[PDB]
Amino acid sequence: SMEQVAMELRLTELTRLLRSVLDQLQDKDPARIFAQPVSLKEVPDYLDHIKHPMDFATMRKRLEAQGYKNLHEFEEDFDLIIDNCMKYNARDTVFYRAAVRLRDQGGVVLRQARREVDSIG
């Protein structure tokens, strides 16, 4: 149907905007701490601690399959990256501190993304 096409075009355009958001957030992680999944070879107990692991590569795979239907879904995954790190790692660690800085910096980006998503529809 034409309606299904129009819906698909909106999803495609959302995907464009989320790719630009994703790039901007990942620039706020210049150490590449959150770039890839935590390795279960190197952290064999991880899944005993963290039930829903997340990282920027995993988000990028979902994004490229047009797997985020709305900004809320995308933000959920970004928040997992931060929140998982802040639980597994202690306050005095480079990992935790990196997550705090990513959260603070990413907030700004996400605030305007929400306005754009609402504005353009």
Category of 26 on φ-ψ map: left (φ > 0), alpha (ψ -120 to 50) or beta = alpha
Spatial distance between the Cα atoms of 80 and 55, rounded to a whole number of angstroms: 8
Resolution in Å, one decimal place: 1.7
Domain that holds residue 12: 1-121
Which secondary-structure segment (H or E) carries 2? helix 2-27
Per-position DSSP letters for the chain, written without gaps between them: -HHHHHHHHHHHHHHHHHHHHHHHHHHT-TT-TTSSPPPTTTSTTHHHH-SS---HHHHHHHHHTT--SSHHHHHHHHHHHHHHHHHHS-TTSHHHHHHHHHHHHHHHHHHHHHHHHHHH-
Distances (CA, A) of 106 to 7, 9, 27, 50, 121: 28, 27, 9, 22, 22
Q: CA angle, 35 as apex, 106 and 93 as ends, to 5°?
A: 75
Q: State how many domains the chain has.
A: 1
> Could you tell me the CATH number of the domain that includes residue 112?
1.20.920.10
Is the CB of residue 2 less than 8 Å from the CB of residue 101? no
Angle of CA points 20, 80, 69, to nearest 5° = 50
Structure solved using which method?
Answer: X-ray
* Cβ atoms < 10 Å from Cβ of 88: 18
Q: What are phi and psi of 26, to 5 degrees?
A: -65, -30
